[PDB]
Amino acid sequence: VQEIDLGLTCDMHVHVREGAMCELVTPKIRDGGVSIAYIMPNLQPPITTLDRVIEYKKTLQKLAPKTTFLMSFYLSKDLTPDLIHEAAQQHAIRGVKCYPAGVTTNSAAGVDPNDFSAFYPIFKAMQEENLVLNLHGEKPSVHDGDKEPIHVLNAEEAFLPALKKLHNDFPNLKIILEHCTSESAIKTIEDINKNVKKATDVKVAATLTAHHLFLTIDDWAGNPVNFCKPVAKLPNDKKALVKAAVSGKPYFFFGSDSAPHPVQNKANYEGVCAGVYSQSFAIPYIAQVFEEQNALENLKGFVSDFGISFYEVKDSEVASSDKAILFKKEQVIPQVISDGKDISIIPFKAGDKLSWSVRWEPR
Amino acid sequence: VQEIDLGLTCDMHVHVREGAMCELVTPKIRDGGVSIAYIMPNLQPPITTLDRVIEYKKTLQKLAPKTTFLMSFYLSKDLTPDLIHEAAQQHAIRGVKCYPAGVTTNSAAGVDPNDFSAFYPIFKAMQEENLVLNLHGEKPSVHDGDKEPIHVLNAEEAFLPALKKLHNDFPNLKIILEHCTSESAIKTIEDINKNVKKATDVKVAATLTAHHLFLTIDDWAGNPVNFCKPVAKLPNDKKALVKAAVSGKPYFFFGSDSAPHPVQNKANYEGVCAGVYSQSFAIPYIAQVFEEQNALENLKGFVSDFGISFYEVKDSEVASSDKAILFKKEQVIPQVISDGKDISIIPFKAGDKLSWSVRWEPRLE
Ligand SMILES: [Zn+2]
Ligand SMILES: [Zn+2]
Ligand SMILES: [Zn+2]
Ligand SMILES: [Zn+2]
Numbered sequence: 001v002q003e004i005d006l007g008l009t010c011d012m013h014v015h016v017r018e019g020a021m022c023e024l025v026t027p028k029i030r031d032g033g034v035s036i037a038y039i040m041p042n043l044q045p046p047i048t049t050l051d052r053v054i055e056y057k058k059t060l061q062k063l064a065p066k067t068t069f070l071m072s073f074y075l076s077k078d079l080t081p082d083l084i085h086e087a088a089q090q091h092a093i094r095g096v097k098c099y100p101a102g103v104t105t106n107s108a109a110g111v112d113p114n115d116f117s118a119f120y121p122i123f124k125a126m127q128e129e130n131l132v133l134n135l136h137g138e139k140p141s142v143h144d145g146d147k148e149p150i151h152v153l154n155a156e157e158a159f160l161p162a163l164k165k166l167h168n169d170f171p172n173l174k175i176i177l178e179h180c181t182s183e184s185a186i187k188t189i190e191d192i193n194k195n196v197k198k199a200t201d202v203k204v205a206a207t208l209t210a211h212h213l214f215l216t217i218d219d220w221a222g223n224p225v226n227f228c229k230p231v232a233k234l235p236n237d238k239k240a241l242v243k244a245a246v247s248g249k250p251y252f253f254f255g256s257d258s259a260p261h262p263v264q265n266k267a268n269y270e271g272v273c274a275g276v277y278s279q280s281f282a283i284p285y286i287a288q289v290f291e292e293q294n295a296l297e298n299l300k301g302f303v304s305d306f307g308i309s310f311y312e313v314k315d316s317e318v319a320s321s322d323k324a325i326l327f328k329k330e331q332v333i334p335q336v337i338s339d340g341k342d343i344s345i346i347p348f349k350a351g352d353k354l355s356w357s358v359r360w361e362p363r
Numbered sequence: 364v365q366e367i368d369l370g371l372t373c374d375m376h377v378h379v380r381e382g383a384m385c386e387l388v389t390p391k392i393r394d395g396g397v398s399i400a401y402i403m404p405n406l407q408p409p410i411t412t413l414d415r416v417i418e419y420k421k422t423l424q425k426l427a428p429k430t431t432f433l434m435s436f437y438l439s440k441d442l443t444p445d446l447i448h449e450a451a452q453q454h455a456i457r458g459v460k461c462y463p464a465g466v467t468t469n470s471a472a473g474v475d476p477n478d479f480s481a482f483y484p485i486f487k488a489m490q491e492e493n494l495v496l497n498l499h500g501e502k503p504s505v506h507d508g509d510k511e512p513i514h515v516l517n518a519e520e521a522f523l524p525a526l527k528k529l530h531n532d533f534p535n536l537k538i539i540l541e542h543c544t545s546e547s548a549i550k551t552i553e554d555i556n557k558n559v560k561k562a563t564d565v566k567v568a569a570t571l572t573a574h575h576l577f578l579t580i581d582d583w584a585g586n587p588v589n590f591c592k593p594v595a596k597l598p599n600d601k602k603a604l605v606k607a608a609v610s611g612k613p614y615f616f617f618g619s620d621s622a623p624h625p626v627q628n629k630a631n632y633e634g635v636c637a638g639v640y641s642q643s644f645a646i647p648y649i650a651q652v653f654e655e656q657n658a659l660e661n662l663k664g665f666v667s668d669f670g671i672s673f674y675e676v677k678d679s680e681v682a683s684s685d686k687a688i689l690f691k692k693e694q695v696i697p698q699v700i701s702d703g704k705d706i707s708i709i710p711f712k713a714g715d716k717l718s719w720s721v722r723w724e725p726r727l728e
Binding site for chain 1: 504506512514515516579580581584585586587588590594597598599626629630631632633634635637709
């Protein structure tokens with residue numbers, strides 16, 4: 001019967017796809033306890049045009065009238081500085097998401113993190129419009145050449161100098177290292193923020209998923225349902241991520257990277273789709289971690305305050321002022337999330353018990 | 364055509380299962396270029412009795428009369444020193460294979476490698492009978508307690524102290540660290556063999572698979588068909604394995620760990636079966652590596668000489684004196700291996716090119 005008032009919760013890294021999948025999962029943002037969602041653009045084809053991002057947002061709002069949607073473009077050679085200014089001036093986007101080519105779902109149209117300079121006109125326009133640059137910070141794999149090989153376990157660490165160069169070259173650009181998975185990345189974000197004294201001083205932040213606070217390599221070795229990018233790494237990495245999430249620092253906040261796939265796309269003998277589905281119980285998953293760490297006092301900062309501050313979400317843009325309330329009523333995660341038609345998704349931690357449930361309080 | 368006479372080739376780590384799968388796969392030992400096969404025992408139930416291992420060998424010999432079968436027991440709670448002596452004296456087994464409990468396929472009846480002491484009477488009997496102790500050298504994963512976490516990436520390295528203690532405590536026992544996957548393991552096998560002058564000096568050997576000479580973690584992360592145990596690890600590990608395989612050292616030789624699974628046991632969202640199926644093109648896979656490494660002169664040692672020497676295979680045990688001839692005919696690995704009934708297997712490197720092919724020639728002398 002214990003309750004925690006989390007206010008206007010934020011999930012700053014959401015995939016809702018299109019079609020019937022989108023109709024199934026978009027109402028789960030609210031059901032999982034999230035008021036505000038930052039919507040990723042890696043559709044097929046990626047979202048790179050104004051009319052597409054406008055229609056997509058209106059489609060989400062039709063499906064969930066109480067959810068606040070922040071939208072993004074997919075970083076691509078199709079983008080122009082003029083397009084960035086137009087989209088920003090119409091409040092059609094809040095940021096631009098960068099996928100390195102080949103590293104994850106629908107990243108074939110993505111970029112080379114060896115030649116980010118080709119997108120400096122875009123970053124310049126984003127900086128002028130106070131838009132956020134979201135990075136999938138993994139270098140593409142390479143096992144040859146003059147250089148130490150890059151593989152799924154060190155690809156994030158190998159990306160960190162690209163992060164530092166972007167922050168150096170665009171010091172007023174807000175940049176997010178999305179879904180951090182390595183101890184090395186946590187330390188880099190902390191070191192970048194060494195001189196920050198209030199939350200509004202943060203320019204470079206990192207999001208943390210629910211599933212990387214639980215998983216290590218042992219959990220997805222043999223279990224495609226736990227396979228995502230960046231891959232869950234070693235116990236020392238998991239410990240560093242959990243310490244960061246409960247740290248109370250303004251430069252870490254919640255982004256689930258909830259990535260829904262129909263079960264048949266996870267049960268492949270080759271080319272398994274990467275992604276973990278956590279939307280249905282997003283805030284309860286996080287509460288489990290914060291309870292185990294005796295850090296529930298810091299839950300609201302991680303899932304509400306810090307994301308709102310970083311994205312400068314105004315009360316005038318919220319779709320609903322309802323507050324998310326956690327209450328300590330145990331529940332069992334179902335085996336599947338289904339639309340009763342052709343889509344079944346296996347949820348993260350299917351079959352496990354969670355100590356907290358989430359409801360909504362007006363005003 | 365360029366040809367290499369590989370003679371009596373051996374694959375010292377073979378799974379052929381039972382029933383219809385066995386009927387499909389056992390003929391592929393010969394088709395893949397292998398004369399001598401060491402047959403692993405992790406059946407359901409595991410092979411732990413004399414009559415079972417005798418009847419199993421008879422089944423295999425019927426399916427492949429020209430293949431030489433060396434048999435093993437599974438290291439289980441039920442094994443007794445008297446049974447080791449009995450099976451050895453009847454030439455019913457050449458060794459005993461140890462699976463750490465829970466680490467891989469049909470390992471639930473296996474051991475705790477943290478307390479091997481309960482099996483020391485078995486190892487003493489094996490040592491007296493000159494039987495080989497085959498180790499799946501991985502410690503089971505542990506994430507609780509206060510000691511070192513163990514996970515799929517360091518479980519082999521974590522096992523290496525256990526290997527050294529067994530070698531120290533049973534210095535005359537032939538021991539194989541099966542399917543090595545880590546640079547750490549290669550270094551340990553190399554240092555155990557620091558003072559070895561000829562092949563017959565080797566007491567502790569290691570087998571290397573075909574697929575660990577190709578694969579890294581990147582290749583199985585989203586590809587269940589490439590998932591096996593021990594998992595393929597980092598590029599630095601694969602570098603060490605390939606260098607060991609072409610080293611010409613007598614303490615490394617070929618064991619495929621070819622592990623057939625029906626495709627439906629790989630296309631799972633959880634509990635993907637561990638194992639790569641390499642039998643159908645076993646020797647051509649290895650030839651690919653030795654060619655790319657410019658070490659084809661060392662191929663015969665890796666796939667024939669060293670395994671025959673370590674297991675002390677005699678001409679009198681040999682089911683057929685046919686010689687395996689590698690010839691430089693490019694070929695394309697199929698997408699599926701099937702029996703035309705209910706079984707389809709995805710072979711290793713399905714769809715790829717191989718520079719070599721294999722055929723058989725009689726001994727005419
Ligand atoms: Zn991503
Ligand atoms: Zn994502
Ligand atoms: Zn094994
Ligand atoms: Zn095996």
